[PDB]
Structures are given as structure tokens and as C-alpha cells.
Amino acid sequence: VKKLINSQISLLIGKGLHEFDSLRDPEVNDFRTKMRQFCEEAAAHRQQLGWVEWLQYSFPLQLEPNRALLVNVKFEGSEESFTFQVSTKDMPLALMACALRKKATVFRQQPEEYALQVNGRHEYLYGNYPLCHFQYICSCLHSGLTPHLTMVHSSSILAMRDEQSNLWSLEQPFSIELIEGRKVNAMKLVVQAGLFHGNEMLCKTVSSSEVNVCSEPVWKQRLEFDISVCDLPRMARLCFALYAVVCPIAWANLMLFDYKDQLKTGERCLYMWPSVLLNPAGTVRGNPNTESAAALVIYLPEVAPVYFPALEKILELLREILEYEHEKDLVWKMRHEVQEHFPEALARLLLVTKWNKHEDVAQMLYLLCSWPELPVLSALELLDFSFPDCYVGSFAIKSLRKLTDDELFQYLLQLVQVLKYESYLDCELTKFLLGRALANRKIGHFLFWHLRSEMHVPSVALRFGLIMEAYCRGSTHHMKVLMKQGEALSKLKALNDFVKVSSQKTTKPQTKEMMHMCMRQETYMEALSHLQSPLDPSTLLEEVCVEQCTFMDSKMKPLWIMYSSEEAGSAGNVGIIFKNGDDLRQDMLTLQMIQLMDVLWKQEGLDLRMTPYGCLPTGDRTGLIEVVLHSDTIANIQLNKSNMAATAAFNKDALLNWLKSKNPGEALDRAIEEFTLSCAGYCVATYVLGIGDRHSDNIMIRESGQLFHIDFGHFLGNTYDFVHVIQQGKTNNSEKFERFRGYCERAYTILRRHGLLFLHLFALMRAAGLPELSCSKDIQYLKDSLALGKTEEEALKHFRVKFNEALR
Numbered sequence: 001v002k003k004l005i006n007s008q009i010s011l012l013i014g015k016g017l018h019e020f021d022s023l024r025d026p027e028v029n030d031f032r033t034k035m036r037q038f039c040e041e042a043a044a045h046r047q048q049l050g051w052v053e054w055l056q057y058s059f060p061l062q063l064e065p066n067r068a069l070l071v072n073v074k075f076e077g078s079e080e081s082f083t084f085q086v087s088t089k090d091m092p093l094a095l096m097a098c099a100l101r102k103k104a105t106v107f108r109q110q111p112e113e114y115a116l117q118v119n120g121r122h123e124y125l126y127g128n129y130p131l132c133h134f135q136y137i138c139s140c141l142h143s144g145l146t147p148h149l150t151m152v153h154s155s156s157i158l159a160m161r162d163e164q165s166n167l168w169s170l171e172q173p174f175s176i177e178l179i180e181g182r183k184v185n186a187m188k189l190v191v192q193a194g195l196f197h198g199n200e201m202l203c204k205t206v207s208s209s210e211v212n213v214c215s216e217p218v219w220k221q222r223l224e225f226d227i228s229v230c231d232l233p234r235m236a237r238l239c240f241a242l243y244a245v246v247c248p249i250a251w252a253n254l255m256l257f258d259y260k261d262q263l264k265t266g267e268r269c270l271y272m273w274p275s276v277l278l279n280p281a282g283t284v285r286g287n288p289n290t291e292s293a294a295a296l297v298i299y300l301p302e303v304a305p306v307y308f309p310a311l312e313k314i315l316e317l318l319r320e321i322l323e324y325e326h327e328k329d330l331v332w333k334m335r336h337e338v339q340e341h342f343p344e345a346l347a348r349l350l351l352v353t354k355w356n357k358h359e360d361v362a363q364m365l366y367l368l369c370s371w372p373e374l375p376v377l378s379a380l381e382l383l384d385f386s387f388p389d390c391y392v393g394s395f396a397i398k399s400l401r402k403l404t405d406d407e408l409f410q411y412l413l414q415l416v417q418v419l420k421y422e423s424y425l426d427c428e429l430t431k432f433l434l435g436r437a438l439a440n441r442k443i444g445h446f447l448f449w450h451l452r453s454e455m456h457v458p459s460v461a462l463r464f465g466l467i468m469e470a471y472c473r474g475s476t477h478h479m480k481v482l483m484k485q486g487e488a489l490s491k492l493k494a495l496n497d498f499v500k501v502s503s504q505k506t507t508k509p510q511t512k513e514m515m516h517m518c519m520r521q522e523t524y525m526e527a528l529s530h531l532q533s534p535l536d537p538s539t540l541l542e543e544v545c546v547e548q549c550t551f552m553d554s555k556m557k558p559l560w561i562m563y564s565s566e567e568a569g570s571a572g573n574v575g576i577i578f579k580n581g582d583d584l585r586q587d588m589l590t591l592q593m594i595q596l597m598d599v600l601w602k603q604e605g606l607d608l609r610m611t612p613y614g615c616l617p618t619g620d621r622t623g624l625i626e627v628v629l630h631s632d633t634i635a636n637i638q639l640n641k642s643n644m645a646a647t648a649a650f651n652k653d654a655l656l657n658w659l660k661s662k663n664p665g666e667a668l669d670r671a672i673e674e675f676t677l678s679c680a681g682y683c684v685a686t687y688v689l690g691i692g693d694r695h696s697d698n699i700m701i702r703e704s705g706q707l708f709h710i711d712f713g714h715f716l717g718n719t720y721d722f723v724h725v726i727q728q729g730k731t732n733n734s735e736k737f738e739r740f741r742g743y744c745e746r747a748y749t750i751l752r753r754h755g756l757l758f759l760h761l762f763a764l765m766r767a768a769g770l771p772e773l774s775c776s777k778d779i780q781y782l783k784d785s786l787a788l789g790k791t792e793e794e795a796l797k798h799f800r801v802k803f804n805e806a807l808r
């Protein structure tokens, strides 16, 4: 009956749905019911979409941020093809018109009823864009390859759609009773408790009295906080810290209001988390491992049945140079003038608001409702934990509904990490991400994997697991599509684990050939084959080419899997790298910013030929990396293999000879250009992000000439082989070196004008717990490298010195 789906979901998300049931939590069950109908209604909307509107859902256009061109078009039934000549100028419609003209004038006698599919890929060319704005065409024009498209009728598209369906009174001081506990340590135990409105204290913390090490201690000590109960904001969370003293032990937080605005009472057991001193950013749900978690019971006094006031009761109630408390007063001040004439300074007004005073809040929340929507940029800042308030969040999400699916896609990683700053399961952000994920399958694809990859993490396991379940209710088909991806990753791990065992007992060629025998098994063939790339859902992974597969002799023995597509031709020759043992989250992040840099640069006419390859964690220290084909490490090139076309008299020539071998005579001129531009781009990206530990074996170069970085283990601060290529070999070519210096400088200014975009995004990534990005000013390096507390003309003066430092 309907049980297969629930089992499929359980397997997919990696946790039984019976486990959600076993909680007997009304919040959990109200989420699973509210979001289910939400996701089900979204699925109903989908099946009504026009066949073009449905293409947008399943196959979102992948675009770029006079010139003739060779196309190859074939139809569905017959494998017969036609080769036209169109311009990069032309729309897809004019091409489809040509497709019909040649078809009719050979079969013997309407473009609007068709869509061009990219052969052997989950991509479609449509809309009123010139062909060169499509990234498949732009790719073909960069490799000299010929686009191979396919005329698909609207009738068979509709067949796909159908195939893929289914009280201000309480003035007393706030108090709690610290009863007993159960711990482990050598001394004296003590309980520090603090009230927080996010990253700020509502009042000063209070500690318990010292109670000794052995036990199972007890206090029964009533803790009174310097704040009244009618002044606790809606997002008041009480944060307990426990440590030994003559040594940290455990911490735990919780909201002083339940998920229905009711004031918390009376007794609650707090299963604490290990520590490292208070941690308000931490989760407000207990350590799931009750079997071994240090516990802390407390008592919240009754005070009557008190809810938090509804919104309709909150109804009640020079500067400029600032853009100190006397200053803070001079930005609390004319509250109304900010809204009236400085709407985009809301964030600075929201943190001068006295959140420990219900009136200063109600007056702030009054302005917020009449507040005009802000740009996407300002909204990304309001999402941070330093704006924890209930209504500030909704205002931020309200100002992100104008996000384009390509904008949302660029930021989706950060929006997902913010989910950890939440206090309740049902939020505006979750409802927003699910809504967008269900309207764009590409968003939904990466929403799923970003959540699935962290299901091994106890603190987010419940939330992320529930979000995915909800999403699955909204797409029965993608779940099955994602199941196939999971099943492939499952065998990739088993294969990798075997390769780890085998290479310890024997050598590479024996393990490689026995690796191949493992892959040749039916269960492995019918699992690694015919799936959408988790790295890129539009990229299809059809036939696994076992003979071409292998592994690296690193310590983690990462796998090298190649594919081929009996349709896509050369576009179907693609590979993926399976890695198990390392954390690939920071690598994905760096590649997300380099991609952004590439977009920002491209959105001003600067194409530095960057290679932002795919990187996706899929599980615990498990992820995938897109193979950049036709490339090689500088190490292997400068190694200077004997009697090979890079045979050089000097080490300085090993690279330029390698290019000359791959780029004959006149084709070289463009290879030097690809190199110079890609070099400049990654020099800047390296500098801005502070990517360290660079050397000949983590820098790679494409046969096109494009150089690109790999292996991003450390960032944010934690040679005349390029100059020789850039200068064409000539010892003195200032004109060709100054143009490189030119590329770098302009590439740096463009990022500075968008420095706040990178800033806010990294501030949201603090929620990831990346070792290299966790301190509340690890982001300092980024502000320095970008010189953001400063203007352009002289930032390109400071940028100069370091360029001259790196030059010598």
C-alpha cells in the first residue's frame, strides 16, 4: 500500500520514520503534518503547469552571467541527424524552425511546440535567449566542440509530467530552581546559567554554589535573574553551563517559551552536550544520547496560564556620520527617521534596541512592520544569529522572496547553515526553502544533499531528517531518483573500503584489476550506472567505463570513476572522484566563492576562464568531486618526463613546452591567453580567501591553458614559471606582464565592490563549525584582504605592494 514510500523515505534520509513517532513530541508531529500538506499542495500545483512551465521546474535554464556556429539536430524516433549553420545571435526558435524546415523538405510537407534537449543530458535549450547565453553552447564554443541537440515535442514532455506524479502582568524577577545533576570528573562542580537574546545577554549570568565532584550532585538552589518575567523577549533562551573547578564539562540551552508562545513550566530535564564558555548559538534541544549524556534537571516556577502576546497586541507602541553608548543612544534616538530616510540601516537599529525591555521591543517591532523591504544583500545579514528575533526573521525572508533561482542557488549553502540557528522546527526559512525546492528540482536536489550529508550529526539529525521527509512528500519521483544516487554512493564506499584493504596487502595494479572485478559484479554494474550526477543533476552518468576506473595512492585511496554516454557523444565522457575519510565541506565552500568571483567578474565583462569544479559532501567525511578532464598537475609536467613533448632543457620551460605540445603553433597564442587570465583570477582568489599551502601538486593546468587550484584544506591565512609563460618565454615582455598585472587589479576591485556579499555569507557559514571559520573574527582576514573599511583608489595602492612581494 502506502508503506513502500515510507520505507523508501526512511532508507533515503537514513533514519526510520518510526523514530520520529517514538518521540511523542507534539512539535515534531505538528511539523510532519503541517509541512506534509504544504509539500503535497506544492505537488498538485506542479502537475497543472504548462509543458514549458514544467521544463523550468525539472530542467531550469543554465545560463551565463555576429558569430557563426555549427549545430547538429536530430529528432526522437529516427536517429537521423541534420547539421545546420546558425549564429550565436539566433534564438532557439529560429534553430527549431530550421530543424522543421529540413525535416519537412525531406519527409515531404510549428516551432512553438518544441524544446531542444542537450543530447544525453538532463538539460534543455529554450526561452528567448541567444544561443551563446546558454552554458552548453558557451562550453562548445570554448572547446571547439559541436552542440548536439534534440527536437522534443510538447506531447512527450507532458508524458514526463504525468509519469512523474502520484501577559505584561508578571513583574516579578525571573527565577528557576537548579535541582540536581549527574556528571563525570575528578574538585568542585558549578552551574552557570545565563539569559540570551541570541548573541547578547538579557541580563548578567548567575552561577550556583560549589558542589563536590563525586555524584550525581544536588543544589536545589533557586537562581534569580536580574530581569522581570514580563520583559523576556519571545526568543529568550536560558543557557546553562557546567564545569569543574578547583575544567569544562557540558552545556545546554532551551527557550523560555515553547513552540506555541506559552511560557515554559514547570520541570524539564536537560541532557547536556560536551563542552569546548556559555554557548547561546548552540542548539536548544537535548543531547539525544540519554544513555551517557550528563543531565541537568531544573524547575521553572509557575506564575499563574501565560502566552506571549499576539502581534495585534504589540500594536500598542545630526547622526549620519555614524552611518559607544552615547552613539548607540544617537542611533536609538530618532527611531522613525531611520525608517523614513535610512531603511537599509535597520540592522544597526535592531541591535541598539533594548531587547530586555518589552516596550523598546514593541516600539521596534512597530517600525519593522511599516519598514520597506530591503535588498537581498541586507536581508542576508538579517539572517544571522545576531538577529534572533521572531519577526526580524520573517522580514528577512520577506526580502528574499525576490531571489532569482540562480541567486538562491548561489546562497543556498548559507541559508541551510542558518537552519541551525533556529529554535523551533516550524520556521519561515524552512517553509521558504521547501517552497523553492519544490518549484525548482535543481534547488531541491542540492537542498536534499546538503541536509543528507549532515544526518550523522546528532544536533541537526532531527531537523534535517524532518525537512527531507517533508520534501519527499512533495516529490515522489525525485525521491526515487535520489534513491538511485544514494545506492550508487553506497557501493562506491564499499568499493573504496575494499581498495583500502587490498592496497595494504598488495600493490596498485593488482588492486586496480581486482577493483575492476568488484565493479563488474551485477549489483555494482546495476547501481553505478544510469544515475544523475549528485554533483550536477543535469549531468547524466550512464555507462560506467570500468577499464578506465582506478584509485590514487594517497592515504585515503580516493576512487576515480569514468563514464560514457551513447548519445551525448563527447559531452557524456565524464568522471567523478569518490573520497572517503576527509571533510569536503571547506573545499565546497572555497569553490562556491570562486564560482561567485567568476560570476561577479563575468557580470562586468571579465572572463578569467575559471574552473569552479563540482564538490559535494554526501555523508560523514564522504563526498564527490567533478573530474576536470584533459588536465594534469604542474608536478607531473615540471617533473619533466623523458622523451615526452615537454622535454625541456630547463625546468622553466617544462610548462610552456607542455602547452606547445597540446597547442600547435597558432593555437598556442590562445593557450597563453587562457593561462594568463586563469592565472590572474586564481592569484586574486587565492589572496582574497587566503588559501595557503600551495604547491606544484595542488595546482593543475588544462590543455586549454587554463590553470586551476585544487585541494582546499586551509584558508583565511591558516614564481617565474608562470611569469615565463605569461611573458611568452621572452625575458623582458613588460607589455604582456603589465596586462597580467592589469587583469589582477581589476579582478580585485570588482570583488571589493561586492566585499559585503562575501562578508555576510561567511558570517552565516560560522554556523557550519568549520575549524578554520569559527572564531568571531576569523572573518577578519577577509575584511583585511578586501580592505573594506576603505575606498577603492588607495586599496589598489596597498594591493600593489603584495603583488610586488609575491613577484620577486
Ligand SMILES: N#Cc1c(N)nc(N)nc1N[C@H](c1nc2c(F)ccc(Cl)c2c(=O)n1-c1cccnc1)C1CC1
Pocket: 550, 551, 552, 558, 559, 560, 577, 578, 613, 625, 626, 627, 628, 629, 631, 632, 633, 636, 697, 710, 711
Ligand atoms: N580535486 C581534484 C581533481 C579534479 N577535480 N580533477 C582532476 N582531473 N584531478 C583532480 N586531482 C588530481 C587527481 N586526483 C585523483 C583523485 F582525487 C582520485 C583518484 C585519482 Cl586516480 C586521482 C588522480 O589521478 N588525480 C590526478 C593526478 C595526476 C594527474 N591527473 C590527475 C590531483 C590530486 C592529484
